[PDB]
Design a binder for these strands. Structure first.
Ligand code: ZN
Lengths: 351, 77, 232, 351
DNA sequence: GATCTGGCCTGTCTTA
DNA sequence: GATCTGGCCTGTCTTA
């Protein structure tokens, strides 16, 4: 549990407050960037390598048969693990276009070929959704479930702009919580079903969701109706049978009151919740550990690495998970003139 | 049109009234209500058919451009 | 407000009434929005300017009713966006700024193509065509590589959000042409068509003697970036 | 005849329009630094080296017995050749300090010891003048004559500030030509006599003086009274015969119309004149050769090197003689932003 | 070929 | 150890 300060020697203006780190086939891919794609990298997706403290970003190129993606700012990432037939899949939906809009299309990202010389080619495919499509939204969560024995996805939460009739050019950039119904999405085909939640009378956003063996556990998430960050934990159980995807749910008494947490996998099913926001002013410093079994969540606080004064007094912080019990965090910086590197970077490692 | 600041204009008004006035220039508080016609949000007007996604209130003055941003910390600030 | 005309009852394209006699004056330019935002970043600019473009795009349709001169009268509006320089027109229409291969904002000719052929070109680019071309670039129906697909949409890789009328700025055109001719004179002081590879110190010496001459006559002193008065 | 541009490597901000090059013992010494002596070189004098176009300046250091010199701008330099007692001397007198006042003190500069590792030590001895001292002046000329067999110095010309009667704080900064009387100064002691002659109507300034075999030839100066640049050549013939240094003069037909010329010795007594100015507005472009013997001055127009457009279109230009058929010329340079190097430099070479 | 020393170079401190 | 290619780096060009 130690933190190494990294230097973003070159290309430190591409990272932004909200962004994604996709961990597939070893190396990690940064996804999301300030502004539209520049010709230095006509795709939008960078490869990340951390070596000797240096943070190095390399350009990635798509394949011939793949469509292209706008740099979605705060999308919902779901890691579809290796199985038949195309590992390793990432389901992205749906985020915020850098031209400020909401995109309701689902993307599937995968790896294609290599190298020749340390080069990875990717491929993205839009996945048409016949629905009953969930309204465009950002900050929601998607999670993959395997049940007897087929694969589906559960989509829940998030915010969206005011309904299309009531949005006034004065309440334009206003945003309210989308209604609380769970959407079951088949990977293929695009049949997406909507189901109501008798126990959940409100939606939320920025809640870390952990899915294990056809069970989904939703940690706390910020509610904008009452401005409360509920400590309750939410469990739901998807039993996929022909032909009605019945869904049940229950409440757990206690869980961590946390929003926008960096959920880094370490063990087989053991995660560390790395921290985030517990109140609108104070940020979570304590690192927590969450083991997931069919009995339930087992939660222990672990010794948080000693933070330098800068990251302890910072107003806000964000980041993502580089995997293998390692995570990346960023702190915005001040000065005069421009640093110009607006973000100092730290790499935290476990064990 | 002479780029005179409000406080400089009040200085001019006081000086021109105290000597031999017979005051000519008007005080500030009558200017502050004098332009309420020139600024927007005074005249009555109406579109047809009614505009899309725009409110019908015709007296909105200077509005903050943020346009209802949910300043809460976790989003884009 | 550039001009206001009358048409009714008909038979005339227009019958003009009021035409701004001094359009470029600072006395006729009505501010609408002020922001403390950078031009480079796109997310903040578009999040603030969303509403303005939205109600502008929604205003072109309906007709206004005002009580003027004692009576109730009806008005239509035509909007012409022409005051942006090239940097902003490129970045707010999805093009690539600013030294791309695809030079023209109004045409599809490339940098090398408009070197051979100079004087023959026809205006093609428009807003709706660029929206459709961003759609082609994102959907990618024929599955081309990056370079071929960039060639098919003639360089539209970002969705345009503001609409801009296909015209030319005057002021920055004059400034660009005067900087081009200043480089031609800086070249002609020395001999560049005899000695094709001049050294950096020689460039400095040629610029210095050209500015010395242009100080002795024409009463000019050099400038780092060239404002318009130096061009005229 | 050839010219090569020189790169003004660092510390080129110590060269001002008026300055001197004292050529003694191989390397030559720049003198007349801009401003007061900064403690980067607490002496004020520099050794100059020209190698592969680089003009490099090194900081000389005085000896223990020397009195120190203020960086005079345009003094009268007289090269006292190598002979008894202490060869070889340079007589500096008198110029004006970096505060606008006139020195009126004769200095004698000599060499002391070397090296070890490419180091040369100098020494400046201020020498008192009893008299009948010459009035403080700048721009005049001092020349060294050897007459049977005593060495003497002839001092003539030069502007001065207005006398302290009409001196007025509105006419403070104005200068007027000093009265035209020749001063004969002994190297030792400081007994100085002053003589007047009818043929010398008014004094001159910036007129190159040549001296050989108890004869002195004055080329054309610039008279500020009638604003003429006289094309008359002047000659004077002195002899020190106990106990008077008796002096006579004569006018010659043709003398060049140049003021502030660069007189470089090339042969035994043959000089090449570069010239400063033909008229107030139009500078001189031609280079000339002046040999001299017991008969008289012999003039010859030699082919001037092809000038770059810059040095041909320059308003003003200055420099000095590095010696041995080599001379150094400077052109003020205009540019924005400040180069900051103000003076671009050329090296001209004869044969 | 070893040695020695002057001058070159770079980083920090000070007022601006 | 010989071969190769992706990507790093550097200089000029373009509108600001
Ligand atoms: Zn064109």
């Amino acid at each position: 549990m130690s933190l190494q300060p990294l230097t973003a020697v070159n290309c430190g203006s591409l990272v932004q407050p909200g962004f994604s780190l996709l961990d597939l086939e070893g190396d990690v891919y940064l996804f999301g960037q300030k502004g539209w794609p520049k010709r230095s990298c006509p795709t939008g997706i960078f490869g990340v390598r951390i070596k000797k403290g240096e943070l190095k970003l390399r350009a990635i190129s798509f394949s011939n048969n793949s469509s292209y993606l706008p740099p979605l700012r705060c999308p919902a990432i779901a890691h579809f693990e290796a199985q038949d037939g195309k590992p390793e899949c990432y389901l992205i939906h749906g985020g915020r276009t850098p031209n400020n809009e909401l995109s309701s299309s689902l993307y599937m990202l995968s790896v294609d070929s290599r190298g020749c010389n340390r080069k990875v080619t990717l491929r993205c495919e839009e996945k048409e959704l016949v629905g009953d499509v969930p309204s465009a939204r950002y900050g929601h969560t998607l999670s993959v479930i395997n049940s007897r024995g087929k694969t589906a996805c559960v989509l829940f939460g998030g915010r969206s702009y005011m309904p299309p009739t009531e949005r006034t050019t004065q309440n334009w950039n206003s945003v309210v919580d989308c209604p609380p119904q769970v959407y079951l999405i088949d990977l293929e085909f695009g049949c997406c079903t909507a189901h109501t939640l008798p126990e959940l009378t409100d939606g939320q956003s920025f809640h870390v969701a952990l899915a294990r063996q056809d069970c989904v556990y939703f940690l706390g998430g910020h509610i904008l109706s009452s401005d409360c960050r509920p400590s309750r934990l939410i469990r739901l159980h998807v039993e996929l049978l022909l032909g009605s995807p019945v869904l049940t749910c229950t409440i757990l008494h206690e869980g961590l009151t946390i929003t926008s947490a960096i959920a880094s996998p370490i063990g087989y099913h053991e995660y560390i919740i790395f921290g985030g926001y517990q109140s609108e002013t104070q940020k979570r410093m304590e690192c927590t550990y969450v083991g997931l079994d069919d009995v339930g969540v087992h939660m222990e606080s672990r010794e948080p690495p000693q933070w330098t004064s800068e990251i302890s007094h910072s107003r806000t912080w964000f980041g993502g998970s580089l995997g293998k019990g390692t995570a990346l965090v960023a702190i915005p910086s001040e000065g005069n003139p421009t640093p110009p590197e607006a973000y100092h970077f730290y790499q935290v490692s476990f064990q | 049109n002479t780029f005179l600041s409000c406080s400089q204009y009040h200085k001019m008004y006081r000086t021109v009234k105290a000597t031999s006035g017979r005051q000519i220039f008007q005080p500030l508080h009558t200017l502050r209500n004098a332009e309420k016609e020139l600024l927007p949000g005074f005249h009555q007007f109406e579109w047809q058919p009614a505009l899309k996604n725009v409110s019908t209130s015709w007296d909105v003055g200077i509005i903050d451009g943020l346009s209802g941003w949910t300043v809460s910390v976790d989003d884009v600030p | 407000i550039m001009s206001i005309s009358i048409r009714l009852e008909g038979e005339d394209d227009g019958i003009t009434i009021f035409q701004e006699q001094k359009p470029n004056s600072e006395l006729s330019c009505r501010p609408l929005c002020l922001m403390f935002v950078d031009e480079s970043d796109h997310e903040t600019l578009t999040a603030i300017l969303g509403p303005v473009v939205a109600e502008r795009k929604a205003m072109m349709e309906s007709r206004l009713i005002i009580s003027v001169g004692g009576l109730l009268r009806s008005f239509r509006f035509f909007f012409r966006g022409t005051g942006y320089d090239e940097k902003m027109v490129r970045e707010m229409e999805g093009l690539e700024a600013s030294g791309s291969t695809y030079i023209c904002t109004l045409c599809d000719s490339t940098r090398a193509e408009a070197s051979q052929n100079m004087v023959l070109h026809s205006i093609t680019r428009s807003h709706d065509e660029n929206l459709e071309r961003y759609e082609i670039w994102r959907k990618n129906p024929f599955s081309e590589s990056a370079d071929e697909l960039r060639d098919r949409v003639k360089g539209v890789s970002a969705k345009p959000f503001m609409e801009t009328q296909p015209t030319l700025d005057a002021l920055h055109c004059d400034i660009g042409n005067a900087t081009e001719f200043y480089k031609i004179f800086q070249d002609e002081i020395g001999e560049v068509y005899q000695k094709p590879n001049p050294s950096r110190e020689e460039r400095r010496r040629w610029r210095s003697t050209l500015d010395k001459q242009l100080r002795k006559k024409m009463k000019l002193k050099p400038v780092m970036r060239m404002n318009g008065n130096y061009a005229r």
